[PDB]
């Protein structure tokens, strides 16, 4: 809605499914990993009120990305496993303007990625259940 | 603008086709990789056609529609004759999948746009098609 653009979801179909939406300021990305991506914490900014969603399940270690001023995300890529029985992301990593991060999570299987030749990452929707089934995102120019 | 990937090798030469008003079609050369593509489509009243990489292969046309649009674009990046190419393309419209266009196997990609579509493309091509990336346009 109102010109938003939205590509992924990818991994799979179990969980219930998230959606942030593009409004808010992204400040952090938390993600959470063991032999697979459990989870992630999305901090952000709206109106001067931080707020933190967290989606997926509560295991793994956390791994943060914490976006410096003028930073911002600009890439995303990670493997689409099987875990368990479930289709889940075993491995998700970022990319902002300044370094690249992770891949976080040890489980291989269908690649994807997602490099942004002109735009930015501005929100998250995806599914989570006891790990983090799915993940896509919102997109806005620069 | 929104231009995401692009996905394949580092050679050949780059293309930009920049954003079409609509895409009338898209012809898929191929064989063992993705030899290349045609793209028809309209821009500022005019109807144009571009081709980008070689034009080896047999093509392979998916015609778009009236209220049919482009919702997904895959493929495989793969190793061939001592290059990274396109190995396998594929694209999914709001009606139907089609695909693949190439036989040959690697690393894996996908873009299904959830809410969006496909409205140009650039990348690399040579003899064959290097490296394709679109431009993203909301509904």
Do not use: C
Not at 11 to 23: C, E, I, L, T, V
Not at 34 to 39: Q, R
């Amino acid at each position: 809605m109102n010109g938003a653009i939205k590509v992924g979801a990818w991994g799979g179909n179990g969980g219930s499914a998230f959606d942030m939406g593009p409004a808010y300021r992204i400040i952090s990305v938390k993600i959470f990993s063991g032999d697979v991506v459990d989870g992630v914490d999305v901090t952000f900014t709206y109106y001067g009120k931080t707020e933190t969603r967290h989606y997926g399940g509560s295991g793994g270690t956390p791994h943060e990305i914490v976006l410096q001023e003028g930073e911002y995300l600009v890439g995303m890529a990670g493997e689409v496993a099987n875990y368990h029985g479930a289709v889940v992301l075993g491995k998700l990593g970022f990319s902002t303007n300044k370094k690249a991060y992770g891949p976080f999570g040890n489980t291989g299987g269908t690649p994807f990625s997602l490099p942004i030749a002109a735009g930015k990452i501005s929100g998250f929707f995806g599914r989570g259940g006891k790990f983090l089934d799915a993940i896509g995102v919102y997109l806005e120019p620069l």
